[model samples]
Target: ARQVTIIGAGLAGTLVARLLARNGWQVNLFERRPDPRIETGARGRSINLALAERGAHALRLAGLEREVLAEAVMMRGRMVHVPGTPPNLQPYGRDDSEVIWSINRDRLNRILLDGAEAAGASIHFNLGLDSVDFARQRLTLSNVSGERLEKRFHLLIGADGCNSAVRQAMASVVDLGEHLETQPHGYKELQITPEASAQFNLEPNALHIWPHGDYMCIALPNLDRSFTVTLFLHHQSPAAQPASPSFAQLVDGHAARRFFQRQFPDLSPMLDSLEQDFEHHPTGKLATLRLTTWHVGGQAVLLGDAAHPMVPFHGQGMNCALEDAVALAEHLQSAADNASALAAFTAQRQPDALAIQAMALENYVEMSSSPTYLLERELGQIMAQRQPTRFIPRYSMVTFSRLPYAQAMARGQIQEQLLKFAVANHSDLTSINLDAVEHEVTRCLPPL
Candidate 1:
C-alpha cells in the first residue's frame, strides 16, 4: 500500500485522510494544535459555517453527511436585517426544498477526526512539520514536547492552510507560482444569546445579513440556540482605531462613537462586554491565494487552502476544499503511477480553482455593499423563484449546482451580464416579461 502523510487536521486534512485510509492507503496525519476534544476554552474563530448543497454533497461522499445533518440547523435563505425596515426574505431557491445548513465548525472537525481515526488512519496531535525535503521524500517535524524527528513517506500532501508550511517548504525547491494577497478588510465575532425559553433570538432558519453601504454584519444560527454574529469592516474603520487617553487627549473621540452609534447600533445591546471581546478576539484577515501548480515531482501535492485560498464572501471555501479531496482521491485511484495522478490533479483542478477565486472576490462587493442597481436584486429574486430548475442565481449556481466551479462561474458571469441588460431596458420589471430571460438562460446552461 502507498504511504501518505497529510499535514493539518482541519476539515480538508481530516476528510482527505478518511478517504485515502478507507481506500487502503497507510495514512499519517499531523496537527499543530492539541486535540480539540479536550480543549475547554474558546478558539474564537468563526463559530460556525453555512453549508450549502456542494459542501453537503462532498460530506455525503465521505459517509458523514447524515451524521452532520442530524446536528445541522437548516437555513432556507438570507434574512435582510435593516434597522427600522421590515426584514426582507430572500429564499436561496424557488422551492422550499433548497436550503443551506448552519454547522458548528469545531463539532464537524471533531467528527471528521474521529471518523478518520476509525478508518485506520494514525493521527498525531500537537506535532508540527518543521521542513520537508521533497527530493528526499522526508519531513522533519517537532512534537509538542519540542523534540525534533524525521519521517519518510512515499507521498506528502499539504492540507495545512493558506499559510501552509508544506507549500512554503516546497517553494524552496520549485517555483509554484504561489501568490498571497490580503484584502483591506478584517472581521470580528459577536453573539446573540437565546431567550429564557431557549428559543432563537431571531428566525433560526435563515442566515441573517445587515448589509450597510461599505460594510456588513452577518449572523448564522448555532446549535446552542444562539446566533454567531460577525462584523466585517475595513481595516481603517473607526472601531479599529487606537485610543488616546487622559483629559489632555481626545483619542477615539468621535469616529469610534459614531461608528457604533450608526453602523452597529443593534449589536451594542447584545455585546455587554463589547470592549473586552473586541480587545481579545482576533481580527481575521481576508486574502486571496493563487497558485499555478499544486504538485512537486508527484511525491507531494497541495490541497484545500494550501492549493487555492479564496475570500469567504461566496461561502464556497469549505465546499471547494471538500471537493478537492474527492477529486484528488478519484484521480489517484485511476492513475497507474503516482506521477500521473499528481499531474492530472493539478491539470483538472487549476481552472476550476481560479474561477471560484474570482467569483468569491466579486461576491464580497455584492454582500457587503448595497446592490448597485435595484434591477439586479429584483432579477435575482425573480429567477430564484420562477425559474427554479433552469435559471439559478449566481449564488445558487456556485452553491447548489454540482457543476464544476469554473463552469458555474462562467455561467454566472453570462447570467449577470444578461440580467444587467434586461434591467436597464425594462424600468417597470412588473410589466416587463421574463420569458426571454428564461429562454436565454436555458440556451446558455448545460444540459442536465
Candidate 2:
C-alpha cells in the first residue's frame, strides 16, 4: 500500500484522506489549524456551500452523503427580489423536491475529519507543512510546539486551498504552469437574522437574489433560521466609496437609497451594519486558478482548489473539488505508474475545468446584473420553457444538466448565439409567437 501525505484538512484534504485511507493506503493528514471540533473557536469565514447534485454524488461515493445531508438546508429555487414588488420565485427545476442544499463548511469538514480518522488515517492538527522535497519524496512539517519533522511518503496530495504552499513548492521543481486572475468586484457577507421564534423573513427553501443592474445582493437560507447574504459590488461604486468623494457617484445619492427602498426593502435594516461587515468581513476576491499539470513523478499531485479555483457564481467550486478527489482516487487506483495516472487525470479533466471556469465567469454577469433589454430575458426564458427538450438556459445547463462541463459549455455557446439572433429579429417577445423560435432552437441544438 502507498503511503499518502495530505496537506490542509479542509473540505478537499479531508475527502482525499478519507478516500485513500478507505482503500487501505496509509495516510498522514496534516492541518495547520487546531482541531476544530475541540477548539470550537475558528468558525469558517464562509459559513455554507450550495451543495448540489454533483457534490452530493461525491459525498455518496465517500460514504458520507446521508450524514452531511442530515445537517443541510434545502434550497429549491431563486427568490428574486424586485423593486416595489413581492419576491418572485424561480424554480430551479420543475418540482420543489429538486433542490440544492446549503451545508455549513466547518461542520462538513469536521465530519470528514472524523470519517478519515475512523478509516485509520493518522491526522495531525496544529501541524503545518513547512516545505516539500519532491526529489526525496519527503514532506517537512512544523508543529504547534515549533518542532519540525520530516516524513517520507510514496504519494503526496496537496488539497490545500487557493494559496497553496504545496503548489508553490511544486512550481519550483517543474513547469507545473499556474495562472491567477482576480476580479475587480469584491463580495461581503451580510446576515438576515431571524424574527422572534426563529422564523425566516422570506421563503426558507429558495436562494434569494436581488439583481440591481450593476451590482446585486443574494441570500441563501441557513438551517439556523437565518440567511447568509452576500453583496457583490464594484470596488469604486458609492456603496464602496469612503467618507469623501470628488465626483458624483452612481450608488450613493439617490440610487443607493432608492435601490434599498425599492429592490430590497426587507433587507435595508439588515444592511445598516453593512459597512461594519464590509470592513470586518473578508472581501472575497473571485479568481480562476489554472494549472497545466497536477502531479510530478509518482510522489505528488494537487487536487481541488489547489488545482483549479473558479469563481463561486456557478456554485461549482465545491462540487468540482469533490469530483477532483474522486477522479484522482480512481485514476491512482487503476493506473500502472504515477506518471500515467497524473497524465490521465489532467488529459481527462483539463478541458472540463477550463470550460467550467469560463461558464463560471459568465455566470457572474448573469447573477450580479440583469439583462439590459427586457426582451432578452423574455426570449431566453420563453425559449427554455417552450423548447425544453432542445434549449436550456446557460444557467440550467450548468446547474441541471448531467452533461459534462465541456459539452454543457459548448451547447450553451450555441444557445447564446441563437438567443442573440432571436432577440435581434423579434421586437416583442411577449407578442411574437414562440413557435418559430422553438423550431429554430430545435434545429440548432444537438441530439439530447
Candidate 3:
C-alpha cells in the first residue's frame, strides 16, 4: 500500500523514482512507449536539450552529473548569424563555467532510466495510461497489445507530459484548472551532419541561431559532431499564400529551400539536405501550457509537462522538468503524508511553474528576433557583472544560479526594465553610465 506508482517514465518520473527509492520507498515507473534503449524511440520529441545549473544540480543529486556532462557539448554562448555580416558569439555568462549545455534528449533519458533502475525502481514500458480511477484509486492502463488492466496504487503521478492521462483523470473529478495555449510558430526538426571525417563544420561548443525577426533556426551540437536543427515558422491555413511569413507558403521542397535561401543563406548552403528533411520531418508544436494546481487529493499529482508546459525558446523545459523531480521528491519526503505532501508541493511549485511559463514565452520573442543585437546583450552582461548582488541578468539568474525559477522570472522582469533604463534608447554601451546604472540598480533591485 505504501509503494508509489509513477505514471510517466520520462526524465521527471525516472529521476523522482530514483530519488524516492533511494529514500527507501518502492517505486514503479510507467511509460507508454517502448524503451528507447531496446527500440527506436517515438519521433517528434525535441532533438536537443539545454542543460543548465538547475538540471545539473538535480542530476548531481542522482549521481549522474559527471556521467551526463561527459557527453554534453558545453554551449558557452549563442552564435548569432546575420546575413552578409560576420557571425557574432554572444557569451551567455561571465565565462565558460557559467554556461548551459547541448545534449541529446534520448541519451539523457536512457541515462536517467538506468540510474532509476539501478536505484531500485521497477520500470515498465509499453503501458499507455488508459484512464485513472481516482478516488477509487484504481488506474486503468493498457499495453501495446491492446490489453487493459486496472491496478491500485498509493500514489498516482502524471509525469506523462502534456497529454497526461493521470492529469485528465484528475480533471474528470476536479479541475486541475489547466489549459494549453498554442503558439503561432511551430517547429520542424532538421539536422546538420559533419564532413566525411566527422569534424564539426561550425563551432561545436556554441548554439547556432539564424534569427529572422519573426521566426528563427537554431542548431545544437551532438557528440557525433552533428547538429540537430529546428526551424520555427508561422502556422497557417493552406490557402494563405503571400502571407509572407506563413508556414503555408512553404508547403513543398521548393518553397522551403527558397525560404531558406532568403532567410538563412549562410546556413542554407551548409544544409544540403534541408528540403528533404523539411518535407519529411514532423513539425513539433511549441506552445504554452499552464496548470492552476498540480495535485488532486494527494493520491494523484502532476509533474513536469503534466503540470506546466512552456515554449522551448528558453531551453528550460527539460531542465525545469528534471528540477521538478528533485523538488517533488524533496517535498514528498518533507511532508511524510502523501496528501499533505502533494498539497504542499503544489503550493510551493505552482507559482514557480507559472512564472517560468510566461518567461519562456517571452524568451521565444527574445531568441527569435532580438538575439542578433549583441550590443544590448553584452552591455547587460557588463551591468550584471558590475552589480553582482543587486542586478543580475535574467538569463544568468535562470541558467547560472540555484535561485528559484519564480524569483528568477519575477526578478527578470524588473531586471529587464533596469537594463532598458540603463541603456535608455541607446542599445549600446558607449554612453551608458556604470555609476548611474549601479545607483538605479540599487534603488530598484535590492541586493539578493
Candidate 4:
C-alpha cells in the first residue's frame, strides 16, 4: 500500500521516483519505449535542453546536480544574427556568473534513470499503461511482447507526456477538463557541424537565432562540437492568402536550400547538409496542452507534460516539469492521505503551469518578431541596475531565480511597461532620463 506506480520513466518520472524512493517509498515506473541506455536512433525528442535555477534546485535536492552539470555546456546569452550586420550577443543576466546550461536531453534522461535506480526505484521499459481503474486502484498495462496484465496500485502518477495514456484513462471516467492549443508553426531539426578541429563554427557559448517575420531558426551547441538547429516555419500558408515559403512550399532539398539561401544566407553556408537533413528529418508540431484538473480522487494524478504541456519557445518546459516533481514529492511525503496530497499538488501547481504556458506562447511572438534591436534588450538590463531591488529583468526572474512562475509572469508584465516608458523616444543610452525612469520603476514595482 505504500508503493507508488508511475507511468513513463522520463525526465520527470525518473526524478520524482528517485526523490520518493529515497524517502522510503517503493517506486515503480513503466516506460513504453525501449531504454535509451541500450537503444539508439530515437527521434522526435529535442536533443538539447536549457537548465535554469528552478530545475537546479530540484536536482540539488535529489543530490544529482554535480553529475548532471558535468555533462552540460554553458550558454551565456542569445547571439542574434541580422541579415548583413554582424551578430549581436544579448547577455541573459547582469554578468557571466548568471547563465543557462545546455545539456543533452538523452544523456540527462540516462543520468536521472541511474539516480532513480541508485535510490532503489524499479524502472520497467518497453511497458506502458493501457488504461486505469481509478475506483478499483488497478492498472491495465501492456508490454512490447503484446502481453496485457492487470496490477493493483496504491498510488499512480501520469508523467507519460503530451499524449498521456494515463490522462486518457482518467478522462474516460471523469471530466478532468482538458484542451490543446497548437501553433500554426512546426519545426525541423537541422545540423551544423565542424569540418575540422572539432571546434565550433559559430560562437560556442551562445544560443544562435535568426529571426524573420513569422518564422525563426535557432541553434544550440552540443558537447560534440555540433549544433542542433531547429527551424520553425508554418505547415501551410493561410487559406486565401498569398503563399510564402512554408513546409508545403519547400518540396525538396533543393527548394529548402533555395529558401535558406534567400532568407538566411549567412547560416546557409555553415549548414552543409541542410538540404539532406531538411529532406529526411521529421517536422515537429508545436502545441500547448492545458487541463483544468490534474487528478482523479486519490488513485491517480498527473504531472509535467502529462498535465500541462506548453510551447518550447520559453525553454522552460523541462525546468517547469522538474519543479513539479519536487513539489509533488514534498506534498506526497508530508500529507497524511493520498487524496489530500494529490489535491494539494494540483491546486498549487496548476496556476504556475498556466502562467508559464501563457508566457511561453507570448515568447513565440517575441522570438518571431522583427530582430531585436541591441538597445531594446540592453535598456532592460541597464534599468535593472537603476532600480535594483524594484525592477529585475523578467528573464532574470524566470531563468535566474527561484520565484514562482506566476509571480515572474506577473512582474514581467509591469517591468515590460517600465522598459518601454524608459526609452520611449530615445535610441541610445545617453539621452534617456535616468531620474524619470527610476520614478516610474519605483512607482510601479514593489521591492522584492
| TM-score versus the correct structure, for each prediction | 0.90, 0.87, 0.92, 0.94
Better of 2 and 3 by TM-score: 3
Note the clash tally of each candidate. 0, 0, 0, 0
lDDT of 1 by residue, 75-126 (tens): 9898887778877888787566689889999889988998899888999988
Query: Candidate 3 lDDT (Cα, whole model)?
Result: 0.82
Candidate 4 pairs with clashing backbones = none
| Preferred candidate (TM-score higher): 1 or 2 | 1
Top-down TM-score ranking? 4, 3, 1, 2
Please list all clashing residue pairs in model 1, or write none if there are none. none
Residue runs of model 4 more than 4 Å from their true location after superposition: 39-46, 196-200, 370-379, 422-433
RMSD to truth, every model: 3.9, 4.1, 2.8, 2.4
lDDT of 4 at 259: 93
* Top candidate (lDDT): 4
Error of 4 at 24 (Å): 0.6
How much is the lDDT of residue 189 in candidate 4? 88
- Residue 349, candidate 2: alpha-carbon lDDT: 79
lDDT of 1: 0.79
Candidate 4 on 1-448: residue-level lDDT in tens?
3799999998889999999999989999999988888866756444888898888888999999999989988899999888878888988876876899898998999999999999999998888899887777798889878899788998899999988999999999889878888788989988887552143348888888899978899888877667888999999988766476689898898998999999998888888888889888888888988998999888889999899989999899999989999999999999989899999999999999999999988887777672235565677767777778888877788888888999999889987876666667776778987777778878888898
Residue 7's lDDT within candidate 1 is: 94
Q: Please tell me which model should have the higher TM-score, number 1 or number 4.
A: 4
**How high a TM-score does candidate 1 get?**
0.90
